[PDB]
Amino acid sequence: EGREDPQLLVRVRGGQLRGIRLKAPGGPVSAFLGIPFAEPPVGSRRFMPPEPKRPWSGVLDATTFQNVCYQYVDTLYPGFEGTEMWNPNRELSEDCLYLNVWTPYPRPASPTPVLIWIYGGGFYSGAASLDVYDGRFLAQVEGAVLVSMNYRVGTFGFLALPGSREAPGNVGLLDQRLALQWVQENIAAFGGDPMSVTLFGESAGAASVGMHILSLPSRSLFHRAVLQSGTPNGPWATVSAGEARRRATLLARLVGCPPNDTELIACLRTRPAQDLVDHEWHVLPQESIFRFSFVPVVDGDFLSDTPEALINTGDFQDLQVLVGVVKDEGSAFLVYGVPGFSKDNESLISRAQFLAGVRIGVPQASDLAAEAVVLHYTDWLHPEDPTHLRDAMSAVVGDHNVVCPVAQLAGRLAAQGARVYAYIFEHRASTLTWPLWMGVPHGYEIEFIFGLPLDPSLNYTTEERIFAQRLMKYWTNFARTGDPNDPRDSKSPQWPPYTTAAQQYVSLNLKPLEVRRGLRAQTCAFWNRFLPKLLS
Amino acid sequence: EDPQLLVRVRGGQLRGIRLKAPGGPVSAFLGIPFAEPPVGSRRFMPPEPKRPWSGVLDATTFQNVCYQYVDTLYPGFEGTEMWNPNRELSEDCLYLNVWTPYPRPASPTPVLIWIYGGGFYSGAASLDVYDGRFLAQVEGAVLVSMNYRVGTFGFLALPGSREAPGNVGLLDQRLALQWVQENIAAFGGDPMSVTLFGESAGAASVGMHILSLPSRSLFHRAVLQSGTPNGPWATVSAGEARRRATLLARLVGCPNDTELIACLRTRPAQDLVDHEWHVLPQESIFRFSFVPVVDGDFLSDTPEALINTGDFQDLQVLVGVVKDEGSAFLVYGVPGFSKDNESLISRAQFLAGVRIGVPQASDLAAEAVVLHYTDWLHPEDPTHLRDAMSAVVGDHNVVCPVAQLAGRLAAQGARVYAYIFEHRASTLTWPLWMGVPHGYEIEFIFGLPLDPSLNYTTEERIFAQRLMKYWTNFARTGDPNDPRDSKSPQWPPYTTAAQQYVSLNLKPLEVRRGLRAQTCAFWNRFLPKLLS
Ligand SMILES: Nc1ccc2c(c1)c(-c1ccccc1)[n+](CCCCCCc1cn(CCNc3c4c(nc5ccccc35)CCCC4)nn1)c1cc(N)ccc21
Numbered sequence A: 001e002g003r004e005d006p007q008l009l010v011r012v013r014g015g016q017l018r019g020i021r022l023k024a025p026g027g028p029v030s031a032f033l034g035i036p037f038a039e040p041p042v043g044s045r046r047f048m049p050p051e052p053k054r055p056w057s058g059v060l061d062a063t064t065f066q067n068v069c070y071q072y073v074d075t076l077y078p079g080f081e082g083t084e085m086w087n088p089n090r091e092l093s094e095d096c097l098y099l100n101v102w103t104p105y106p107r108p109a110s111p112t113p114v115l116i117w118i119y120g121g122g123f124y125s126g127a128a129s130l131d132v133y134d135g136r137f138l139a140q141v142e143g144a145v146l147v148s149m150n151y152r153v154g155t156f157g158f159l160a161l162p163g164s165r166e167a168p169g170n171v172g173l174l175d176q177r178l179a180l181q182w183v184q185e186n187i188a189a190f191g192g193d194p195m196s197v198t199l200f201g202e203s204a205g206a207a208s209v210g211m212h213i214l215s216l217p218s219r220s221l222f223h224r225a226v227l228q229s230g231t232p233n234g235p236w237a238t239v240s241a242g243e244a245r246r247r248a249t250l251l252a253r254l255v256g257c258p259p260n261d262t263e264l265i266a267c268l269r270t271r272p273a274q275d276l277v278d279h280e281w282h283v284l285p286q287e288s289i290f291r292f293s294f295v296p297v298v299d300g301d302f303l304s305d306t307p308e309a310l311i312n313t314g315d316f317q318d319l320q321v322l323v324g325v326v327k328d329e330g331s332a333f334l335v336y337g338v339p340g341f342s343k344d345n346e347s348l349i350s351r352a353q354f355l356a357g358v359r360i361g362v363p364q365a366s367d368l369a370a371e372a373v374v375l376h377y378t379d380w381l382h383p384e385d386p387t388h389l390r391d392a393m394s395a396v397v398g399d400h401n402v403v404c405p406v407a408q409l410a411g412r413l414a415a416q417g418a419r420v421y422a423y424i425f426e427h428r429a430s431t432l433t434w435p436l437w438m439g440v441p442h443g444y445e446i447e448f449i450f451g452l453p454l455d456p457s458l459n460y461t462t463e464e465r466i467f468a469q470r471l472m473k474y475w476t477n478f479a480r481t482g483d484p485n486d487p488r489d490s491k492s493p494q495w496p497p498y499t500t501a502a503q504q505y506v507s508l509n510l511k512p513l514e515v516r517r518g519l520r521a522q523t524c525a526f527w528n529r530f531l532p533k534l535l536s
Numbered sequence B: 001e002d003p004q005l006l007v008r009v010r011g012g013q014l015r016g017i018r019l020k021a022p023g024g025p026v027s028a029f030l031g032i033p034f035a036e037p038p039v040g041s042r043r044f045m046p047p048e049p050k051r052p053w054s055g056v057l058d059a060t061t062f063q064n065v066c067y068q069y070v071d072t073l074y075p076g077f078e079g080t081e082m083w084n085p086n087r088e089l090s091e092d093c094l095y096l097n098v099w100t101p102y103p104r105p106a107s108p109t110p111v112l113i114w115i116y117g118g119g120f121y122s123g124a125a126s127l128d129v130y131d132g133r134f135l136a137q138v139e140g141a142v143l144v145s146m147n148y149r150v151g152t153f154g155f156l157a158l159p160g161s162r163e164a165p166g167n168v169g170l171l172d173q174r175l176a177l178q179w180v181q182e183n184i185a186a187f188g189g190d191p192m193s194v195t196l197f198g199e200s201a202g203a204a205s206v207g208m209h210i211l212s213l214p215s216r217s218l219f220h221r222a223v224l225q226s227g228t229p230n231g232p233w234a235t236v237s238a239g240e241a242r243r244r245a246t247l248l249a250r251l252v253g254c255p256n257d258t259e260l261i262a263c264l265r266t267r268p269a270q271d272l273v274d275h276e277w278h279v280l281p282q283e284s285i286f287r288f289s290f291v292p293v294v295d296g297d298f299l300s301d302t303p304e305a306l307i308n309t310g311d312f313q314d315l316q317v318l319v320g321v322v323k324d325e326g327s328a329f330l331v332y333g334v335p336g337f338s339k340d341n342e343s344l345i346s347r348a349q350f351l352a353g354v355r356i357g358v359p360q361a362s363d364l365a366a367e368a369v370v371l372h373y374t375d376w377l378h379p380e381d382p383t384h385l386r387d388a389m390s391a392v393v394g395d396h397n398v399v400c401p402v403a404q405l406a407g408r409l410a411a412q413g414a415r416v417y418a419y420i421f422e423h424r425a426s427t428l429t430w431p432l433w434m435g436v437p438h439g440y441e442i443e444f445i446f447g448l449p450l451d452p453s454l455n456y457t458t459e460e461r462i463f464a465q466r467l468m469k470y471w472t473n474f475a476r477t478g479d480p481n482d483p484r485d486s487k488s489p490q491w492p493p494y495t496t497a498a499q500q501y502v503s504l505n506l507k508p509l510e511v512r513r514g515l516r517a518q519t520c521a522f523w524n525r526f527l528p529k530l531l532s
């Protein structure tokens, strides 16, 4: 240091860091990007839990995002903003276990509440460097400290041969936990309050947040949680030890590693990263959508039991949670598998195409259950309307994978001590490039919660700017206090907790808050109470 | 002697009685024999035509009510007794009543033939609510109604036997229908324009006549109010009918078909009635011991099958339901339900009543019903659970079978008009929570509110006049709409595409779509897959 900016030099337990002074619309912020929190999980260390990062010497440059964990890059629609905005924005490498911190500039006087973001991507994709996860607006506007970490995805993160030592499973979650430990020891260097850490995340990230709520060593690492369009319970976020075993073994076969677990994992470790990616979809048991090959396994360790059992019997008094869904959870999933669906036409389907989709949307379902789904979603006045069928198929996927799982997470949590706040996000970005029929797709609240509309250069409407400010007040009010409502405010409609008695939740859109009752109450009774029994 | 009151039917001469109706005199011919009394050796057998008589037969009063169980759940209560026999009980009961205008119509008039209900165990054409005078006087109709055997006497079957072949109560009705063809002309009635109408078990009978080829040449149009030949209660199979008869016979100490039937014939009628309730296979409501049987004769195949494959092109049908088909049945065996309180039930009591209301339901199937009918916002609210139990019973037994029948007839070329009846009679003595219970549209169709001595409101007098117009317009032309009155709005036909039906209430007609579609899809399409 000679002439460096005094506000950008900070020490953490691993050594010295140099951050960068970033411009936000309303002023500067400090970012420390690419801070290593683990030893690169490379070589003999692929599939293994992560080890703490060994201290370095000199000043580590933390001015730019680090590598993205090895993943499948989407190619369904080349050039298309709608998919590319989720694609990796840095080089892919197994050396990817880094985290990012944004804090006010100058760093705040007294300790600030900390928000830790966990990206989604079905446990097979995503990076904390994506433009929609930019911590600068929350940091600058709400005075918050914001952290996001990379964690291994796909085979690299979740390939398990359960009961073995060399590939125990759940190591992606263990990267996330390591980063939470890192925040406990280090966040105070940045002015963050380690005693007020809220986890938030979306899709698979939300599932992860809930898995930290259900895993005891994670509990002392955070104090509150927000789950956006995802849950640990439900059909896609976990697998039995058996199923994960079948998958690893199948993948092994596929890459030339025939099966003892040591021989097998070793052979997999000699395989090139890309080979594993190039083969990971092939191990899924059925033609299906909203199913991912390598996901958290119920190992009897990180997850002592299935998320369903753990939410049915855990005590949560104790715990404050904000949960919700977007209007159209299913729609955008339809174009990755259901015949008849495309982003480039209005996706009007036949009744045949619907029955056919239901079997892919609900792959575990017998003929009888498939009929039950179809019968429940048919509009009997117009059982042939292409437009209604299209919307039903979207609803089936949304309801089965997100809405109804969230619906019970909120149900069981509230009944067992938790203060729960629930929402449905109903605003379609004016700037969306997916077709109008898709409505408000899975993923499209994120840019509003992070404050992107406030970037004048991004072409959001004025209404949208104000809407994002509101939502940022909601999230950080929740982080700061466990109540998304503003104490200094006077109704200005209140966000009431979700209870089992009242089942209250709010609409999030451009209009002031509207309180509604019951998240798809009838329809979720179908998925959560009836359907299970049509497997039993 | 009044020449108007003298008629020559094929069996000989009759004397009727001139009755007083609000707006003018009507001629009535009550208690006309149409069959040989089905007594002694004729018990359980097809009726035979009545033998000619000498002189002038006195047809001025109602005849005996066919032998049946008499209700005593609430002795003295108008709400139950109004359905009870209002004449002496006898196996000698095959008589019919005719009302016509006075004077006898100048030209041939449309004929309505009423078939009463009462679960094939009860009923009589003589009940005040089936009084044909108002329709006769006001709409100029010729209205006929017949007694038919009920319970063991009408429906005890040992299928395949010569002696007790089953469905004889149906054959009674058919004999009455044949009697109308041969004789009604003499009363100024038009035999080429006969409309059958009937409610509850009466409705299923009409349904059965639609589905039986010999009955088809005896009428031209049909009205089924709150009942259908398909559904869980209106038919039994040959195997099950035989089981019940056999069991009943055992129960009265009757030890080969011929032998068994001979002994049953030697039995006082009240013995058979004493033991009829005891042959039902389960604790249940809306199931009746002795009902028509799928015989391969009168019914060539199950109604479900018959409606499925039949050709119903030139056929006009009027079908409908009341708002609260299920409520009144709940007090007849579902724990927690009483007429003398608001009947608010617990969830446990709901699951329990579902097993009684849907006696065939497996553990999983009942939970399906329970899960579909719960208010998930509500979901332990006693008012709801009570209403839902009423809804389960109505839907399962009437509404959804109606919806199913309306659907197949329309699809197969019939012309269908449908309604839901939503007005609760002001005179009703059943509790408010029962709403508009099974059976309580009849007084309106028959025009009873027009009798000022009955204390109906003025609104009701006007309402009943409208219904009388709908039904008799329907009888005259196959279309219930007033064919010279403009602005209405019009009662549109039921079609499978649009599914249009109307509400009959104090307000002017309102057209709705789907009766009552999500729920009937449940009953008609899902539940059956949960049996097989
Ligand atoms: N031919 C191949 C080869 C390999 C794979 C294939 C296909 C596919 C696939 C592509 C098109 C059609 C069918 C199948 N896939 C993709 C199937 C699953 C894709 C789901 C895409 C999706 C759609 N949405 C909703 C819309 N919003 C998002 C997305 C995406 N990511 C995110 C991340 C967080 C929140 C939202 C969001 C990415 C894509 C587009 C929209 N989320 N995720 C692969 C997947 C693997 N794990 C491994 C290999 C391959």
Ligand SMILES: Nc1ccc2c(c1)c(-c1ccccc1)[n+](CCCCCCc1cn(CCNc3c4c(nc5ccccc35)CCCC4)nn1)c1cc(N)ccc21
Residues within 6 Å of the ligand: B069, B071, B073, B079, B080, B083, B117, B118, B119, B121, B199, B200, B276, B277, B288, B289, B328, B329, B331, B332, B333, B437, B438, B439, B440
């Ligand atoms: N211990 C015994 C012995 C014999 C019988 C018993 C009980 C009962 C019974 C009474 C009370 C509670 C449980 C059982 N029952 C009664 C079971 C059948 C009761 C049906 C009641 C009912 C209710 N509704 C709806 C309301 N409106 C009506 C009625 C009644 N009839 C009609 C006829 C046409 C249209 C409407 C209508 C008669 C009763 C009350 C209301 N219709 N029918 C008997 C029946 C048999 N088939 C044979 C024997 C006996």
